[PDB]
Amino acid sequence: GPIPTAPRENSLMFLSTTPDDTVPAYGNVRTPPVNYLPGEITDLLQLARIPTLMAFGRDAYVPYVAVPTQFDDKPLISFPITLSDPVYQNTLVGAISSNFANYRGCIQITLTFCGPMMARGKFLLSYSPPNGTQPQTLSEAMQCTYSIWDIGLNSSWTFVIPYISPSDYRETRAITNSVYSADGWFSLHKLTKITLPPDCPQSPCILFFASAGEDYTLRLPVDCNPSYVF
Amino acid sequence: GPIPTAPRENSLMFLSTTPDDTVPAYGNVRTPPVNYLPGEITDLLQLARIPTLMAFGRDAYVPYVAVPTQFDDKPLISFPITLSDPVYQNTLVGAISSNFANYRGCIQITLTFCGPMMARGKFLLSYSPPNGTQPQTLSEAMQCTYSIWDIGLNSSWTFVIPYISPSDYRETRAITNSVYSADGWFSLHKLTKITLPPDCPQSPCILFFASAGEDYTLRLPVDCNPSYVF
Amino acid sequence: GPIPTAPRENSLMFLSTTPDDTVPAYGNVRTPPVNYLPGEITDLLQLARIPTLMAFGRDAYVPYVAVPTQFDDKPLISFPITLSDPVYQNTLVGAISSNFANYRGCIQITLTFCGPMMARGKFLLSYSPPNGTQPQTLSEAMQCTYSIWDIGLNSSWTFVIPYISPSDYRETRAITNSVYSADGWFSLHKLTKITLPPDCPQSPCILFFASAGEDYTLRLPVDCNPSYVF
Amino acid sequence: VLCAYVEDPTKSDPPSSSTDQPTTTFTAIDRWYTGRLNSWTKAVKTFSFQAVPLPGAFLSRQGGLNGGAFTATLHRHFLMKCGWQVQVQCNLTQFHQGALLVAMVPETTLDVKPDGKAKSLQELNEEQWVEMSDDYRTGKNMPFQSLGTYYRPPNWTWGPNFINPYQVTVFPHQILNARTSTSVDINVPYIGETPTQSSETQNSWTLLVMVLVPLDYKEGATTDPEITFSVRPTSPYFNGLRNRYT
Amino acid sequence: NHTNVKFLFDRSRLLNVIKVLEKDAVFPRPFPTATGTQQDDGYFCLLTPRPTVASRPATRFGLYVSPSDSGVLANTSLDFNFYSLACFTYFRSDLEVTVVSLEPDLEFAVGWFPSGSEYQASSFVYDQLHVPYHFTGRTPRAFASKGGKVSFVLPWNSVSSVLPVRWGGASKLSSATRGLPAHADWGTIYAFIPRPNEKKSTAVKHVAVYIRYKNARAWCPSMLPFRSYK
Amino acid sequence: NHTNVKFLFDRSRLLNVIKVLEKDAVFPRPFPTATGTQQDDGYFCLLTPRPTVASRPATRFGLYVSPSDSGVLANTSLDFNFYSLACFTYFRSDLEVTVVSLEPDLEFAVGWFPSGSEYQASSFVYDQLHVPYHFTGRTPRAFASKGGKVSFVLPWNSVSSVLPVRWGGASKLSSATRGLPAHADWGTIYAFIPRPNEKKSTAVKHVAVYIRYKNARAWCPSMLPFRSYK
């Protein structure tokens, strides 16, 4: 006879993200084949790992950092490492990951010195953990995690920003995210004063990228910000 | 075709304690691991067995019992053995078990003589079954279940209160619970008069605990008393 | 995906005698054991077979039958064999079986002569099938099914009333139940005149019971008569 | 030595919320840190506790608790993850009676003024022993939120960082009785909502000395025993190297 | 095993009675909130057993005794059946939310956004109707039938490993951020009538939010709340 | 794997709020449309994440800022939750349509016609009632219950192999047909009240169209939309 079924309390409820199919209406359709198209994106972490340009206030922002010839004991640029920060809005790290809720991995800033060929000098690349006050002095930059980038064979340096966090994942749209302030600070410092040859232009430009590490992982898709369309 | 199902009389009923799952909305989430935390409470009988302090009216109640030097034929303290009695409200026996409906086991009063070191004496520890009138005389205390606690090597005595009941379980929020009155009476009597040495303080204090035995078992969770929050 | 179920025409119908379970609300309860209680009634035919007293109009009715010394050609008592008859209302045959709809078996009238010890005599025990007129004469009693009960070793006779019926079962609350009238008639006749010794009381009493045979079977529980409570 | 929740609280893996090498050690790890704590007298009532927050004591120096090169390592690393090991001594003689309750309370705000921010060092000297009032029993003194002029301020009647004073023996504890021992020995591992918490703003444990039986001694006998303690972190894992905290 | 932690907290209980949205909401601005801020109060249920105020995690719990007219009253929620049986410090479990209507024949719909994310607060003009941006999104917006109940099980989404039942640190810097965990929540839900904003009614429809903790795991044994002696 | 392309776009989201037909429709005439053309506007939902206008595929997306009286406003749809996470060029998936009513207790019905086909726009006189020709057909006309929801999964029916998220060619010849794909749609749906045209009411009943992309496959990595810096 009839199978006696007791329907549950969520009967006749259309839930949006129900992980199950529905009734096919117009089945038995042979779709045309798509074997000819190359480069199928199986996973959107194939595009967080592609290095895309950052932005810098000096709606006309600048992907590079000008390098003034004045030697000084303060950072040449120092932006905080937060994926809601407006130096990451138009990357592919901070634009994919802003539409999610949690991340875990290593942001990988790829540098590119776009100055002349016979430039010689060193740069210091200090990532700081989130402290109560932003590090400015080069002495305050040596004590953090650093790596010295020379303009030698390395006209392109990929400084892997570490993942140091009291939780397994981080809130990806949050200014604070943690204890008191701003989640860290990358800071490109100039270490020795830069020898630019004459009849070659002074004030070179260093071009910054922002990719993601191989262990970069995301979680919990949220409804995105639809304010790209206005 | 369709499977012919006859839905039951309790269809579209959300019952609170239904022993079954529901539809997952936001699945495929890898939670951060919790292997690092020690001491996972699997079972709340791991905390009924931990000896916690009792209370005594002399909202400033006293965990100990003062011991006056007057020798007397009446109990030094005698509280009834009921888990709704206000000498058990702030233990972990009478606070876990009050939020349930039935118990079965042996309350284990752990004593601790907090007097000076050179005290010498004996105490009698008489548990009585529920009688029509509370036992007061030490002669009325010897005839019940007793155990003689000396201030010798034993400055800490754990008197296991037996479980004698006409039912397999007991109502855990009830003054009466049984035939006429009050479910039993522990009673710490002093047996010999206590020799306290001079230049050591008279009137010592005995500190009482209330744990649960190894066979202590609880049943039928009920909605608790929310009057801790006012 | 979803299993396509077509619910039947009796959906959301609470039927009272549905032979199926329902959702457990407060499960995982270990009940206290009942191994100590003796005499578990598995089946209520364990109490239709226990001989209980009948009633006789002479609300003060009489379980026995007085035996007058007048010898006579008419029955000493003759009640009809119907389980709605008021000589069966307070037995355990006619009180269990009245709350059902059908029966099948042999009513077993257990006699007990409660007179003095030196009584000597015979009794005739004639069950009649349902005839158009009740048998009265002892000559009309010999031609039916009879058995001669002597006051010898047998001061207790269990006359098994046969089951003779045109249907496999009988309506158990019905005056008529069959062709014209009253379903049969047990009749205790006195056969020889009863020798009671002097200085022993005249007019003895015979005590009647009403049990059920070993093949007595019942069927179709109905809603009972709630007029015991007014 | 009352180990907590494990056989060996020294066993501790590095945190899984870091990508860098943890600074597993510093220049003096097999030494204790001795600090003063207020003396216990007759006027101390029942349940008047005294909390020593860890690692809140190495920073504020509660009772001369100088952290040496552990405070100067805690200020130079962001995430810190250690299991503590305290040792409270108190010279209970034969001439005293009473019983302290030395526990290691997980995650409470007992150094917080039931009426403001965090306690100073002078205000820990004025009161000397924090009386178990209705606020500390109901948790009504963990710091209330500044809601602002818009929301009407509710009547805060309860807060989940209370002390039920009759239930403090559930924690890792040893009773400093007058006639069994004179010192306790508690060793606890790391706990926390994360695999490693912060350094400047964590309170994962709290040394807690609670008077269960009030001190009584005869006049002219041994008077007013002092309370010391000795905190020592077991297997720390410092992550996030940076300069000194500002 | 009725004291089993996985069994004891695995049952539905009330958390908050929140109001149902009828327009594009303004999420409550963080503390402190000055007067004159136009926002929508009490429409959001921060899914946490810890005390809340204005749909944000609170340090203490506070109700109202004499709620006079001046000021905006704040929806403060607490899980009364939790803390009376929460003799522990940490508690990770997967939440099961059930949203029962408190309005006769209401068609509502339940949004959600994870721990750390935020409400999307605007509206797009579909067909000259202000359809808000909480009808869409990558997060579960379950829809109820007319007179039905929304039920789904949410995972442990937060970036904390566990939820601190008792917490003593500081999320931001100190001075009244002691004992206030930031990432101890399964998220936040809110009810909305699935009609556009020009069909906003005048009545203020409430709805009730239930909670079941699937797969409860508790760590670090701690206290139970103080019961008074009055 | 929450960044998985097959997992990320596999969830329901809003597309368009279309009006429900109450007569035999006139499908919107192709662009350009002169004034005075009697037709039925905005009743059709062209099922495509690409921007639409007047139920036909559009090049750009355009909303209204100050919708004054002169002219007929046009139902422009866009999948806001798609393009913010569509960092690719091509996208083939099987569509799952859910049509939720925005009218209290509406009995509607959802037509469909494939990619490249057209609406059948006339009426046959059944029993002196103008029954239109969208009650019949070889395409799915799913019928809703009174207050129910229409849901079915549509296949990739179009003659294009994939749907170009970004397209640069010309479907017809040039001069404003650049970037306008012709066969990038799963079809078109429309809601109709299943009553004949003499029972046409006066109110203008809306309905909402949801979309789930079953078995999403994406090719050719490309950009994400530009987020402003204001």
Q: What is the domain-level CATH number for residue B227?
A: 2.60.120.20
Q: Which fold has domain D1-246?
A: Jelly Rolls (2.60.120)
In the block, residue with structure tokens 């001046």: E70
d(CA F152, CA B96): 52
Could you tell me how many residues make up chain D?
246
d(CA F58, CA F184): 11
Nearest to B36 by CA among D81, E182, A216, D172: D81
Closest Cα in chain F, distance from residue E171 (Å): 28
Residues C154/C128, Cβ–Cβ less than 8 Å: no
Range list of β-strands (E), C77-121:
102-104, 107-113
Counting CB pairs under 8 A, whether chains A and E reach 3 or more, is yes
d(CA A214, CA B5): 51
Name the residue facing B7 among A5, A10, A15 (closest C-beta).
A5
Evaluate the CA torsion angle C206, C210, C211, C212 in order and state its sign.
positive
Q: Does B7 touch chain E (CB under 8 A)?
A: no
Closest Cα in chain D, distance from residue E110 (Å): 26
Q: Does A9 touch chain E (CB under 8 A)?
A: yes
CB pairs under 8 A between A and C: 15
Q: With an 8 Å Cβ cutoff, are C8 and A2 in contact?
A: yes
d(CA B110, CA B157): 6
D76: which DSSP letter?
A: T
Mutate to test the interface with B, among F2, F3, F12 (most CBs of B within 10 A): F2
φ/ψ of E80, rounded to 5, equals -70, -35
Contact list, E195 vs chain F (CB under 8 Å):
102
Contact list, C3 vs chain A (CB under 8 Å):
none
Which chain A residue is nearest to residue D238, measuring alpha carbons?
Answer: A164
Q: With an 8 Å Cβ cutoff, are D242 and A162 in contact?
A: no
Q: Which domain holds residue A188?
A: 1-230
Which chain A residue is nearest to residue C1, measuring alpha carbons?
Answer: A21
Burial of A162 (0-12, 13-18, 19+ CB in 10 A): buried
Q: Which domains does chain E have, with CATH numbers?
A: 1-230 (2.60.120.20)
Question: Cα B207 to chain center, whole Å?
Answer: 15
Which chain E residue is nearest to residue F210, measuring alpha carbons?
Answer: E136
Contact list, A10 vs chain C (CB under 8 Å):
none
d(CA A167, CA E162): 10
Residues C195/C125, Cβ–Cβ less than 8 Å: no
Residues C129/C184, Cβ–Cβ less than 8 Å: yes
d(CA E139, CA E124): 18
The residues near B104 (Cβ < 8 Å, ≥ 6 apart) are: B163, B168, B169, B170, B215, B216, B217, B218, B219
Burial of C211 (0-12, 13-18, 19+ CB in 10 A): buried
Q: With an 8 Å Cβ cutoff, are B90 and E81 in contact?
A: no
Give, in order, the Cα–Cα distances in Å from B120 to each of B151, B196, C187.
5, 7, 91
Query: Which tokens sit at E15?
Result: 């958390």
Residue B164 CB neighbour total at 10 angstroms: 11
Do the strands D77-80 and D239-241 form a parallel or antiparallel pair, or are they unpaired? antiparallel
Residues B95/B228, Cβ–Cβ less than 8 Å: no
Residues C157/C100, Cβ–Cβ less than 8 Å: no
Counting CB pairs under 8 A, whether chains C and A reach 3 or more, is yes
Q: Is B229 helix (H, G, I), strand (E, B) or coil?
A: coil
E227: which DSSP letter?
A: P
Q: With an 8 Å Cβ cutoff, are A219 and F84 in contact?
A: no
Question: Cα E83 to chain center, whole Å?
Answer: 17
Name the residue facing D95 among B53, B112, B199 (closest C-beta).
B199
Closest Cα in chain F, distance from residue A134 (Å): 23
Mutate to test the interface with E, among D193, D196, D203, D208 (most CBs of E within 10 A): D193
Residues D212/D101, Cβ–Cβ less than 8 Å: yes
Helix (H) or strand (E) holding F110: strand F109-113
Q: Does A167 touch chain D (CB under 8 A)?
A: yes
Domain count, chain C: 1
Contact list, F2 vs chain B (CB under 8 Å):
28-29
Q: Does A181 touch chain D (CB under 8 A)?
A: no
Nearest to B85 by CA among B155, B161, B140, B137: B161
- The sheet that has D33-37: what strands, in order across it? D33-37, D227-231, D89-90
Q: With an 8 Å Cβ cutoff, are A31 and F8 in contact?
A: no
Q: Does C30 touch chain B (CB under 8 A)?
A: yes
The residues near C16 (Cβ < 8 Å, ≥ 6 apart) are: none
Name the residue facing E148 among A13, A17, A101 (closest C-beta).
A13
Mutate to test the interface with B, among A5, A103, A222 (most CBs of B within 10 A): A5
Q: Does B45 touch chain D (CB under 8 A)?
A: no
Please work out, in degrees rounded to the nearest 5, the angle formed at the alpha carbon of residue B99 by the alpha carbons of B94 and B100. 100
d(CA E164, CA D203): 12
Contact list, B85 vs chain D (CB under 8 Å):
none
d(CA D160, CA E62): 12
CB pairs under 8 A between A and B: 50
Contact list, E152 vs chain A (CB under 8 Å):
10, 15
Q: With an 8 Å Cβ cutoff, are E124 and F13 in contact?
A: no
Contact list, F206 vs chain E (CB under 8 Å):
127, 129, 196
d(CA B25, CA E151): 9
d(CA B24, CA E153): 5
Helix (H) or strand (E) holding E18: strand E13-21
Q: Up-side HSE of residue F201: CA atoms within 13 Å toward CB?
A: 10
Q: Which amino acid is at D4?
A: A
CB pairs under 8 A between D and E: 189
Q: Does A4 touch chain C (CB under 8 A)?
A: yes
Query: Which tokens sit at F210?
Result: 């949801």
Q: Is F221 helix (H, G, I), strand (E, B) or coil?
A: strand
Give, in order, the Cα–Cα distances in Å from C183 to each of C55, C92, C129, C134, C175.
19, 19, 7, 10, 8
d(CA B42, CA E218): 7
Closest Cα in chain B, distance from residue E182 (Å): 17
d(CA C69, CA C58): 17
Q: Which amino acid is at D236?
A: P
Q: With an 8 Å Cβ cutoff, are B44 and E87 in contact?
A: yes
Contact list, F1 vs chain B (CB under 8 Å):
28
Do the strands C205-212 and C52-53 form a parallel or antiparallel pair, or are they unpaired? antiparallel
d(CA A200, CA A194): 13
Q: With an 8 Å Cβ cutoff, are A172 and E173 in contact?
A: no
Q: Is B73 helix (H, G, I), strand (E, B) or coil?
A: coil
Query: Which tokens sit at A32?
Result: 């045309």
Q: With an 8 Å Cβ cutoff, are B59 and E148 in contact?
A: no
Do the strands A170-171 and C64-66 form a parallel or antiparallel pair, or are they unpaired? unpaired
Q: With an 8 Å Cβ cutoff, are C11 and B10 in contact?
A: no
d(CA F41, CA F24): 13
d(CA E38, CA F65): 23
Q: With an 8 Å Cβ cutoff, are F75 and E126 in contact?
A: yes
Do the strands B40-41 and B170-171 form a parallel or antiparallel pair, or are they unpaired? unpaired
